[PDB]
Design a protein around this ligand. Structure first.
Ligand code: SO3
Ligand code: CL
Length: 416
């Protein structure tokens, strides 16, 4: 019997995964056993399995974990599976980069599903503020002009009878800090880390990265983000948006499904926000348009005693039918680019816009030491948000924080 470890990807995560593999089980005449790891403990459990040799056949891995676990020497090469699924041209480039440790020419993980983020907006609020959505979400200048108009607007939510916040975004020292910043960094022409001068180094303190960071964080100093937003997580901001408190916020495609679910079943179909829902990609910066991608991949431990059957299950879970099916349950975009043509996506205007957003997808570099980089970036970005909460983020203060971040990161990148 094969054993798979997964994270809570869908509302009934084990059940959905079992329904997903039921045809594979029938064709191979096996049961696949599943264990669900909470996102909190998943990494600890997976590293304990890597060090001990005691674990599942397959594990889910977040895309940013691939480099670290690969570098431990515990993953089976899966170039054969990826060739079977269509090779490099079967994936968005940003997704293909998540199949390996950066600069390896051997794949160790199979793309499973993508998490990308775009802006949701209140179509009624923008109509009432006189804001063209295409031009608000096309450029930085359009975006900040749109928030200005939304702040000035006399519009009130029909249900709350109160104004809407122009923009809600969190400012907590969580991993979401870095992916909410990344499109602004990238659109300015910056990066979190880059190769330069023969080494990997932080680029958080580059003029371009600082430009992007300051543009975004300064919106919360201009009155466009309510103070209360800064200490909420993405779940709480999503609930504020559903409750008619927010004109604009960034998230993945899951909320699209929930706008069709009645409040009696855990959704928000009856709320004004569900009936007046738009999506747009992140605006272009001066140096280009980028959409953050994350999500999850699958990997096979090389200590598995069922590698041949495990490889057949990776091809199954990576392939068209299972990619389309699982997306109905996760609300996430398939990792397999072919699957985006399915009518389940193309006949839903809001999902078609996420697929437009996908063309601009970009991932973090697949470094073995990525988690140490991310922790240091998150902590220092959280200090910049904390200055925002005081109305004291200046460009020089932001630069000094990112200078400290860059020294810490540069030191982390020198050890292995
Ligand atoms: O604040 S830490 O970079 O020393
Ligand atoms: Cl980067």
């Amino acid at each position: 019997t094969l054993e798979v470890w997964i994270m809570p990807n869908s509302p009934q995560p084990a059940e959905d995964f079992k329904a997903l593999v039921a045809p594979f089980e029938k064709a191979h005449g096996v049961e696949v056993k599943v264990t669900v790891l909470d996102w909190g403990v998943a990494w600890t459990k997976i590293t304990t399995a890597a060090t001990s040799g005691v674990g599942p056949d397959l594990t889910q891995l977040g895309t940013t974990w691939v480099g670290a676990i690969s570098a431990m020497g515990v993953l089976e090469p899966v170039d054969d599976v990826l060739e079977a699924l269509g090779g490099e041209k079967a994936y968005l480039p940003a997704v293909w980069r998540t199949t390996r440790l950066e600069g390896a020419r051997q794949a160790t993980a199979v793309p499973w599903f993508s998490e990308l983020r775009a802006f949701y907006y209140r179509t009624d609020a923008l109509k009432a503020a006189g804001v063209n959505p295409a031009e608000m979400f096309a450029s930085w200048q359009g975006f900040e002009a749109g928030l200005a108009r939304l702040k000035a607007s006399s519009f009130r939510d029909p249900e709350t009878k109160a104004p809407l916040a122009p923009l809600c975004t969190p400012g907590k020292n969580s991993w979401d800090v870095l992916h909410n910043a990344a499109p602004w960094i990238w659109g300015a022409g910056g990066e979190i880390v880059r190769q330069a001068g023969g080494r990997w180094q932080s680029a958080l303190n580059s003029p371009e990265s600082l430009e992007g960071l300051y543009f975004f964080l300064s919106l919360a100093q201009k009155g466009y983000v309510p103070a209360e937003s800064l200490e909420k997580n993405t779940a709480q901001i999503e609930a504020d948006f559903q409750a008619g408190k927010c004109a604009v916020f960034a998230s993945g495609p899951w909320m699209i499904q929930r706008a069709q679910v009645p409040e009696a079943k855990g959704g928000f179909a009856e709320r004004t926000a569900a009936k007046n829902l738009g999506v747009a990609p992140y605006p272009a910066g001066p140096k280009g348009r980028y959409t953050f991608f994350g999500g999850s991949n699958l990997a096979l431990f090389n200590f598995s005693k069922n590698k041949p059957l495990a490889k057949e299950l990776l091809k199954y879970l990576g392939g068209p039918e299972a990619q389309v099916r699982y997306a109905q349950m996760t609300g996430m975009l398939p990792a397999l680019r072919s699957a985006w043509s399915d009518p389940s996506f193309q006949q839903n205007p809001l999902l078609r816009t996420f697929i437009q957003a996908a063309q601009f997808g970009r991932t973090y570099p697949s470094l073995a030491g990525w988690g140490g980089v991310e922790n240091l970036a998150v902590q220092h970005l959280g200090m910049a948000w904390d200055l925002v909460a005081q109305g004291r983020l200046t460009r020089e203060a932001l630069k000094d924080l990112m200078d400290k971040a860059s020294a810490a990161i540069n030191q982390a990148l020198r050890h292995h």
